[PDB]
Amino acid sequence: PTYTTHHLAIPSGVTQDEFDELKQSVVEFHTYQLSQNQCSSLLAQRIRAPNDVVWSIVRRFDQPQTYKHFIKSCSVSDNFTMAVGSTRDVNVISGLPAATSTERLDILDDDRQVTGFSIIGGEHRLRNYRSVTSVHGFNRDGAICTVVLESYVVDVPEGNTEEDTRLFADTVVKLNLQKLVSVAES
Amino acid sequence: PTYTTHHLAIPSGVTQDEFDELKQSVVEFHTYQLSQNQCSSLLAQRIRAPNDVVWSIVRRFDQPQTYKHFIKSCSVSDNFTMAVGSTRDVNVISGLPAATSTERLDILDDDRQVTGFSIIGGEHRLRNYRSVTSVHGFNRDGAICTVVLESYVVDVPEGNTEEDTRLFADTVVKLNLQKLVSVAES
Ligand SMILES: CC1=CC(=O)CC(C)(C)[C@@]1(O)/C=C/C(C)=C\C(=O)O
Ligand SMILES: CC1=CC(=O)CC(C)(C)[C@@]1(O)/C=C/C(C)=C\C(=O)O
Numbered sequence: 001p002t003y004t005t006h007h008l009a010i011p012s013g014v015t016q017d018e019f020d021e022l023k024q025s026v027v028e029f030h031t032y033q034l035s036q037n038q039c040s041s042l043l044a045q046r047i048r049a050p051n052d053v054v055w056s057i058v059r060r061f062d063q064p065q066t067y068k069h070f071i072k073s074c075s076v077s078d079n080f081t082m083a084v085g086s087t088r089d090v091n092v093i094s095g096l097p098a099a100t101s102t103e104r105l106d107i108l109d110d111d112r113q114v115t116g117f118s119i120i121g122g123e124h125r126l127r128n129y130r131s132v133t134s135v136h137g138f139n140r141d142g143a144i145c146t147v148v149l150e151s152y153v154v155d156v157p158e159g160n161t162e163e164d165t166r167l168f169a170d171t172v173v174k175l176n177l178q179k180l181v182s183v184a185e186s
Numbered sequence: 187p188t189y190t191t192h193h194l195a196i197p198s199g200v201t202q203d204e205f206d207e208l209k210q211s212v213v214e215f216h217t218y219q220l221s222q223n224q225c226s227s228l229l230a231q232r233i234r235a236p237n238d239v240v241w242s243i244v245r246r247f248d249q250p251q252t253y254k255h256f257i258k259s260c261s262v263s264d265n266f267t268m269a270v271g272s273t274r275d276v277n278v279i280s281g282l283p284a285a286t287s288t289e290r291l292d293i294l295d296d297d298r299q300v301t302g303f304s305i306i307g308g309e310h311r312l313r314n315y316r317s318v319t320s321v322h323g324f325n326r327d328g329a330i331c332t333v334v335l336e337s338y339v340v341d342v343p344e345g346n347t348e349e350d351t352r353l354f355a356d357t358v359v360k361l362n363l364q365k366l367v368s369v370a371e372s
Contacts, residue, residue: 069357069361070354070357072350072353093350093353093354093357094354095311095312095343095346095350095351095354095355096311096346097345097346097347097350097351098350124281125281125282126281157281159283160281160282160283161283164258164279164281164283164284165281165283167258167279168256168279168280168281168283169281171255171256171279175255175361178364
């Protein structure tokens with residue numbers, strides 16, 4: 001297989017010196033295998049809030065709607081455990097209506113403050129979506145100011161271009177990351 | 187089959203005293219006919235920028251991608267004039283890909299700073315979408331503050347609920363208005 005090189009390109013929204021400190025985290029957590037039909041991207045967002053505050057929000061695998069747009073509801077089983085392997089049924093706002101993507105929790109590491117999930121079933125064109133989010137505290141002069149890194153890999157549907165698929169997924173993650181800013185600042 | 191009454195309910199983001207000044211504009215420009223299969227909503231967004239600056243952005247019928255998300259490109263004909271009746275072809279970012287909704291300019295009023303459009307062709311579920319944006323300057327402690335009002339009417343697709351459709355359309359418009367804030371305040 002072929003692998004991503006997100007450590008070679010500073011994403012927008014981070015400085016060269018901030019990024020230099022995070023390259024180790026990108027390699028460890030934001031590297032995916034790449035098939036010929038896949039694309040992957042890494043996004044970043046600075047947040048004026050303690051990383052412990054941010055981690056506590058994004059850790060909530062059962063309540064993504066608190067920090068994501070376009071989710072009407074999210075339910076988990078009555079025996080849900082916050083553990084690798086638990087799943088959720090996400091009801092998406094799209095005008096179809098109440099669509100559903102079942103997602104499985106892949107990583108939950110409270111020591112490094114990293115989580116991630118993969119989409120394992122649903123009615124959509126984002127087949128084999130996999131995402132990782134890591135939380136990073138910086139003593140940042142009035143904050144712990146946190147940079148959140150979020151990357152994904154996904155299949156490019158036949159009849160889609162890689163740029164088109166990537167542009168859509170990038171737009172969603174960027175918009176959700178802006179919402180995370182609003183929620184974290186309190 | 188009656189008409190909308192958005193002048194009767196204050197939208198979020200406005201004060202009662204601010205809204206009282208806008209009721210005449212809501213009546214004059216933000217009233218739609220409503221059939222039993224349609225819904226309509228009215229949104230507002232405060233912007234710390236001169237109303238003339240905001241107006242110059244939202245007036246650009248040929249360039250919605252400057253202030254809206256999820257638009258890959260926008261083309262108009264070689265004889266395009268910025269005039270009621272002109273149309274544009276919008277290529278939407280959706281993961282389908284490069285989708286298209288053809289839109290017609292309905293209002294372009296430079297004295298009152300109102301613009302509006304209706305969707306006249308495309309491949310989607312926002313049938314008979316019609317939208318109006320109006321710009322409003324307020325003197326606030328020596329600086330101009332702009333309120334943008336944006337409303338729409340749209341058909342509810344069979345199998346959708348009104349809340350679900352409204353929720354989606356409300357989500358899109360609000361997000362486009364946040365991008366408008368960034369562009370105007372830069
Ligand atoms: C918003 C939405 C609409 C779709 O059509 C596909 C899917 C259900 C995957 C999705 O939830 C996509 C979500 C994305 C890209 C990222 C995320 O959630 O962090
Ligand atoms: C982004 C998008 C999603 C759709 O499914 C339909 C359509 C393509 C019309 C649309 O452009 C709708 C845009 C909206 C609600 C408002 C606007 O543009 O002012």
